[PDB]
Design a protein around this ligand. Structure first.
Ligand SMILES: OC[C@H]1O[C@@H](O)[C@H](O)[C@@H](O)[C@H]1O
Ligand SMILES: OC[C@H]1O[C@@H](O)[C@H](O)[C@@H](O)[C@H]1O
Ligand SMILES: OC[C@H]1O[C@@H](O)[C@H](O)[C@@H](O)[C@H]1O
Ligand SMILES: OC[C@H]1O[C@@H](O)[C@H](O)[C@@H](O)[C@H]1O
Ligand SMILES: OC[C@H]1O[C@@H](O)[C@H](O)[C@@H](O)[C@H]1O
Ligand code: NA
Lengths: 224, 103, 102, 103, 103, 103
């Protein structure tokens, strides 16, 4: 459906265009390796950014929620942005995947495996010196019909990517026990890495198809 | 001139509208001799062709047939929802005369 | 000559600017008989054709009509905001003469 | 006329169907004289050409060769899974006659 | 043969480079008679045309003029950064001889 | 027939392979008279051209030079890795004869 997610970020829309989206730490381009771990990502301390370490960038379920987290982290900024983001299968309810071991349950946050591509970003509010601006700038790269026909990933697709250490009791409990990568509970850390790499490969295939087919829809054969 | 695909389809004999409201399930393309055509399906089984050009087409149709093969290839790919196809029901499969795309 | 779509509209008889500032709601395309054309609508109901190539068109327009149908199709399939259409209002629906996007 | 790539292939001598269900790993095109062609491969080594236009092609296939090379370039850059290829097995690489893509 | 756009421009009279390093702000095309042309603008207010095909062009330019309007169109639609534009300053608006694109 | 780009180049005396494994850093095309060409560069400074159509080219290469320009543009905009280029090295910059793409 057409639900949105929200994220405060210091990086302006100029930089996001060039980066192919809002990236994780260390990732420079969307389609360009790096640790991909959901458990390590949600535990990570926020140092000037809303959580974007270990392969994921984090979001908020509402505008109000994104703005309060933006004032805890990026209060110093004379100009930061709140990005409006479409829900899609690159995205994961962190409280549902990690379950009882969700590090910050009150935050109610949703994290994109591999960053949020540019075309998934609906738009952005500017936030001049603490104050949210009413006007919503709309991203030209956004594709409403595509992303309004997609939702977040279900927790069932995320239980195997949860990324707990092999000695963690989560792997011998439900629902994670039936989804454990070989070597986890009863080579785990390398097997969750490679499952995360394949997941991002197959999601990247899906956004390339939508965006790069749009770019080649001008072709006319009959004119030589 | 018709304002829509339905009025356009009424101006032709041996013809009929299909309401799909769905993206294309499959795209098929051929350069084999006498079989230079496109074939599309949808999830519910319904199959359609862009005809091989022949004596039945007038000269001004030739540019639009090739245009129509472009539209279908790239509508398949962008997963674009096709509202309707006006087709000729005296061929097997039914042959496309027009397409509309919406929502 | 002209540096914008509004000024280019002022050079021709039977034309008017339509200001949409909106992406195309639908794209129709026909290879049928004497209706080798494209029609587009918007959310407000407004409808526009790219005309069947005919005796109203000089030979340099032939290629430009094929380009306009290429342009409308990619604008639709990328959701590009179209700013204006200069059209000919003495035909039904209004025949696109030009397009701008900002 | 045929409703799908399999039944279409069987109309021609020296053809087989290839079931890839996979994106193209490489695209290669040439403008060099007498080698005006394309080549695609898949990850573990399957290879396919679109042939140089020549005396083995009737007039109506010439427009369709140009299109097929476009189709494969688009599929390559979009990482779109290809379902099948009908091919002539009497050329090396196997010369593509048709292509289907599902999903 | 030149290694870049700056040098291409130096081979012609009445030309000049414009270093923009920005996306096209607006794209405009016309199919009106005697006005079969494209006009692009930028945020800084600069306006450029691709000229109407006429007697100032030799035959080998016709396909390159059509090509340039295609290039200007997807550059606009993808928000592609244009590095430079070679243009003729004996036309108003200045007419595009060449484009170059980079980060 | 060549089975890959490396084979294609060894069929001509006056060519070589460059291995880039890198996307195009800049794309440049011109409509100016007698310079209707394209020019790409990579970040290492390597420059390449799609030659102006001429008397070195036979008729079947004409369509293929236009394909190559299409290919370089869309490759540049999608940031697709270029694997190899077959090129004629009796010209500066080296003229493209073929291109392969792969990650
Ligand atoms: O324009 C093509 C059409 O021509 C008609 O005359 C024929 O009856 C149709 O089946 C269709 O082929
Ligand atoms: O150049 C084409 C135009 O010609 C005009 O004379 C006519 O009013 C319009 O119908 C339009 O088609
Ligand atoms: O239509 C072209 C085909 O023609 C056949 O005669 C030939 O055996 C095939 O390899 C293929 O080239
Ligand atoms: O390629 C066409 C060009 O021809 C030149 O002679 C003229 O000065 C330019 O303004 C431009 O029109
Ligand atoms: O296909 C074009 C090529 O033709 C070759 O025979 C010539 O030696 C090369 O310099 C190149 O121009
Ligand atoms: Na959504």
């Amino acid at each position: 459906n057409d639900d949105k997610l929200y994220r405060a970020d210091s990086r302006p829309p100029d930089e996001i265009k060039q980066s192919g989206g809002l990236m994780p730490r260390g990732q420079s381009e969307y389609f360009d390796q790096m640790n991909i771990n959901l458990y390590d990502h949600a535990r990570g301390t926020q140092t000037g950014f809303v959580r974007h370490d270990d392969g994921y960038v984090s979001t908020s379920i509402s505008l109000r929620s994104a703005h309060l987290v933006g004032q805890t982290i990026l209060s110093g900024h004379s100009t930061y942005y709140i990005y409006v983001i479409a829900t899609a299968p690159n995205m994961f309810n962190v409280n549902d995947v990690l379950g009882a071991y969700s590090p910050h349950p009150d935050e109610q946050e949703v994290s994109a495996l591999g960053g949020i591509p540019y075309s998934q970003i609906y738009g952005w509010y500017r936030v001049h010196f603490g104050v949210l601006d009413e006007q919503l700038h709309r991203n030209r790269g956004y594709r409403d019909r595509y992303y309004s026909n997609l939702d977040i990933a279900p927790a069932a697709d995320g239980y195997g990517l949860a990324g707990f250490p092999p000695e963690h009791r989560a792997w011998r409990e439900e629902p994670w026990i039936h989804h454990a990568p070989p070597g986890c509970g009863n080579t785990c850390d390398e097997k969750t890495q490679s499952l995360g790499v394949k997941f991002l490969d197959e999601y990247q295939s899906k956004v390339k198809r939508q965006i790069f087919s749009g770019y080649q829809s001008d072709i006319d054969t009959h004119n030589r | 001139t018709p304002q829509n695909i339905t009025d356009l389809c009424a101006e032709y004999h041996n013809t009929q509208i299909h309401t799909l409201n769905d993206k294309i399930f499959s795209y098929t393309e051929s350069l084999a001799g006498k079989r230079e055509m496109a074939i599309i399906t949808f999830k519910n089984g319904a199959t359609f062709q862009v005809e091989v050009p022949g004596s039945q087409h007038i000269d001004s149709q030739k540019k639009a047939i090739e245009r129509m093969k472009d539209t279908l290839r790239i509508a398949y790919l962008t997963e674009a929802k096709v509202e309707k196809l006006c087709v000729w029901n005296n061929k097997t499969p039914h042959a496309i005369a027009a397409i509309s795309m919406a929502n």
